[PDB]
Enzyme design. Structure first.
Site, mmCIF file in Angstrom:
data_model
loop_
_atom_site.group_PDB
_atom_site.id
_atom_site.type_symbol
_atom_site.label_atom_id
_atom_site.label_comp_id
_atom_site.label_asym_id
_atom_site.label_seq_id
_atom_site.Cartn_x
_atom_site.Cartn_y
_atom_site.Cartn_z
ATOM 1 N N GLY A 48 66.112 39.648 -14.587
ATOM 2 C CA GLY A 48 65.388 38.517 -14.013
ATOM 3 C C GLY A 48 65.428 37.318 -14.937
ATOM 4 N N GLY A 60 61.358 30.082 -17.642
ATOM 5 C CA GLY A 60 60.994 29.671 -18.969
ATOM 6 C C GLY A 60 61.616 30.391 -20.135
ATOM 7 C CG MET A 96 55.078 42.044 -19.997
ATOM 8 S SD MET A 96 53.366 41.742 -19.743
ATOM 9 C CE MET A 96 53.347 40.063 -19.181
ATOM 10 C CG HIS A 156 61.510 48.642 -17.242
ATOM 11 N ND1 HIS A 156 61.968 49.742 -16.551
ATOM 12 C CD2 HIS A 156 62.375 47.639 -16.988
ATOM 13 C CE1 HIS A 156 63.084 49.424 -15.927
ATOM 14 N NE2 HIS A 156 63.358 48.153 -16.180
ATOM 15 C CG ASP A 176 62.783 36.530 -7.416
ATOM 16 O OD1 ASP A 176 62.184 37.518 -7.869
ATOM 17 O OD2 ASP A 176 63.531 35.781 -8.104
ATOM 18 C CD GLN A 177 64.684 41.161 -10.062
ATOM 19 O OE1 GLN A 177 63.640 41.172 -10.766
ATOM 20 N NE2 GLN A 177 65.611 42.094 -10.165
ATOM 21 C CG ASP A 203 52.634 29.949 -10.443
ATOM 22 O OD1 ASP A 203 52.488 29.426 -9.302
ATOM 23 O OD2 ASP A 203 53.597 29.707 -11.189
ATOM 24 C CG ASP A 214 48.572 22.645 -23.475
ATOM 25 O OD1 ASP A 214 48.321 22.435 -22.268
ATOM 26 O OD2 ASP A 214 47.827 22.266 -24.411
HETATM 27 C C1 LIG Z 1 56.727 38.887 -15.640
HETATM 28 C C2 LIG Z 1 56.619 37.515 -14.958
HETATM 29 C C3 LIG Z 1 57.829 36.700 -15.088
HETATM 30 O O1 LIG Z 1 57.973 35.988 -16.105
HETATM 31 C C4 LIG Z 1 58.731 36.526 -13.966
HETATM 32 O O2 LIG Z 1 59.550 35.373 -14.150
HETATM 33 C C5 LIG Z 1 59.686 37.682 -13.589
HETATM 34 O O3 LIG Z 1 60.356 37.389 -12.320
HETATM 35 C C6 LIG Z 1 60.826 37.919 -14.573
HETATM 36 C C7 LIG Z 1 61.079 39.303 -14.291
HETATM 37 C C8 LIG Z 1 60.647 40.274 -15.231
HETATM 38 C C9 LIG Z 1 60.800 41.659 -15.076
HETATM 39 C C10 LIG Z 1 61.921 42.169 -14.381
HETATM 40 C C11 LIG Z 1 62.131 43.544 -14.223
HETATM 41 N N1 LIG Z 1 63.237 43.936 -13.555
HETATM 42 C C12 LIG Z 1 63.789 45.304 -13.611
HETATM 43 C C13 LIG Z 1 61.162 44.421 -14.726
HETATM 44 C C14 LIG Z 1 60.044 43.912 -15.375
HETATM 45 O O4 LIG Z 1 59.114 44.752 -15.907
HETATM 46 C C15 LIG Z 1 59.842 42.568 -15.601
HETATM 47 C C16 LIG Z 1 58.676 42.214 -16.316
HETATM 48 O O5 LIG Z 1 57.848 43.051 -16.687
HETATM 49 O O6 LIG Z 1 58.548 40.910 -16.620
HETATM 50 C C17 LIG Z 1 57.490 40.522 -17.514
HETATM 51 C C18 LIG Z 1 58.087 40.699 -18.907
HETATM 52 C C19 LIG Z 1 57.151 39.050 -17.212
HETATM 53 C C20 LIG Z 1 56.102 38.434 -18.194
#
Ligand SMILES: *[C@H]1CC(=O)[C@@H](O)[C@@H](O)C/C=C/c2cc(NC)cc(O)c2C(=O)O[C@@H](C)[C@@H]1C
Ligand SMILES: [Mg+2]
Length: 305
Positions: A33, A37, A101, A103, A110-111, A144, A171
């Site tokens: 993903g 930012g 975080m 996983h 969105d994906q 958000d 910020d």
């Molecule tokens: C989650 C929020 C974030 O910043 C979003 O932009 C997410 O769309 C980015 C995706 C993160 C993501 C993707 C997967 N795919 C297998 C698994 C996850 O555990 C996470 C995830 O935990 O994102 C955390 C790190 C952000 C802060």
């Protein structure tokens, strides 16, 4: 719930073992993903063996600013709910903040949307329940909302991912990058400011997007519907503020689902529904008593095996 109590205490148990987090402790597995930012990686926390998702926010700032951001994020250690992504920790290292975080093997919606084309009504009922509960957790222990901020897993779990507890962090990214405003309520775009009510709006819009398989403003005035069944960001935000809210097409979706989103998408925030109200809305009560195989739908759709 008891399966929910068991998994929350298993999470914490695993988390108690990790200790303080450091750059050199992480091995990259892949990128996930990425965009927004910061980039996001699937990582291995070598000492503990835990897989985690690590967001990296490239930022050059004073040791004071970064020590403040890190302390404001520690706040996330007390946010234990089945509807919020597990937080392992946050730290700074060599010009970049890390936020680590749980996983979520399903990724974000969105994906999933990209891959499925459109998400069925009954699955969106489960999503709706989770987001409402997630939002009710955040209000009762203090945002958000958009598809990229809803993560899912092969155990059928649906959770919000959010790091805007800090603020100052936000910020300091403004000069670098800024997340899309195309999910903000008309009253945030008119400056009135947040209430939980603006997140209901965003939830409403996200659900319509996922239902029809496209960002819904402007409406598909076309046979695109028939096909189904340009605007610059500033033209779009005026459009949100000045035109009527999107809605689902009729025929294809139940009336209860139509009504649920209509009530989330009412422009006046005083009239727009509240969480207490959404929690008992008929779409919700009906979805809650369907036993929907979300994991099974999810694994099939994105090809998890
Ligand atoms: C989650 C929020 C974030 O910043 C979003 O932009 C997410 O769309 C980015 C995706 C993160 C993501 C993707 C997967 N795919 C297998 C698994 C996850 O555990 C996470 C995830 O935990 O994102 C955390 C790190 C952000 C802060
Ligand atoms: Mg290092």
């Amino acid at each position: 719930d008891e399966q929910q109590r068991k998994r929350l205490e298993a999470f914490l148990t695993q988390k108690q073992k990790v200790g303080e987090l450091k750059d050199d402790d992480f091995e990259k597995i892949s990128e996930l993903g990425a965009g927004n930012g910061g980039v996001v990686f699937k990582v291995s926390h070598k000492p503990s063996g835990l897989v985690m998702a690590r967001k990296l926010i490239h930022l050059e700032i004073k040791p004071a600013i970064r020590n403040q951001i890190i302390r404001e994020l520690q706040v996330l250690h007390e946010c234990n709910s089945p509807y919020i992504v597990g937080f392992y920790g946050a730290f700074y290292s060599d010009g970049e903040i890390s936020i680590c975080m749980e996983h979520m093997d399903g990724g974000s919606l969105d994906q999933v949307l990209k891959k499925a084309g459109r998400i069925p009504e009954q699955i969106l009922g489960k999503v709706s329940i989770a987001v409402i509960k997630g939002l009710t957790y955040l209000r009762e222990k203090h945002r958000d909302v958009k598809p990229s901020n809803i993560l899912v897993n092969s155990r059928g779990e649906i959770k919000l991912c959010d790091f805007g507890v800090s603020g100052q962090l936000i910020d300091s990214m403004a000069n670098s990058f800024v997340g899309t405003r195309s999910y903000m309520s008309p009253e945030r775009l008119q400056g009135t400011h947040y209430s939980v009510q603006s997140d209901i709006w965003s939830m409403g819009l996200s659900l319509v997007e996922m239902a029809v398989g496209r960002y819904p403003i402007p409406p598909p005035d076309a046979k695109e519907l028939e096909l189904m069944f340009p605007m610059a960001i500033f033209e779009l935000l005026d459009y949100i503020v000045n035109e009527p809210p999107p809605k689902l097409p009729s025929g294809v979706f139940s009336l209860e689902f139509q009504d649920f989103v209509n009530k989330c998408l009412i422009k006046n925030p005083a009239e727009r529904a509240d969480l207490k109200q959404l929690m008992v809305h008929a779409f919700i009560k009906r979805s809650d008593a369907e036993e929907v195989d979300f994991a099974g739908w999810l694994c099939s759709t994105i090809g998890l095996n």
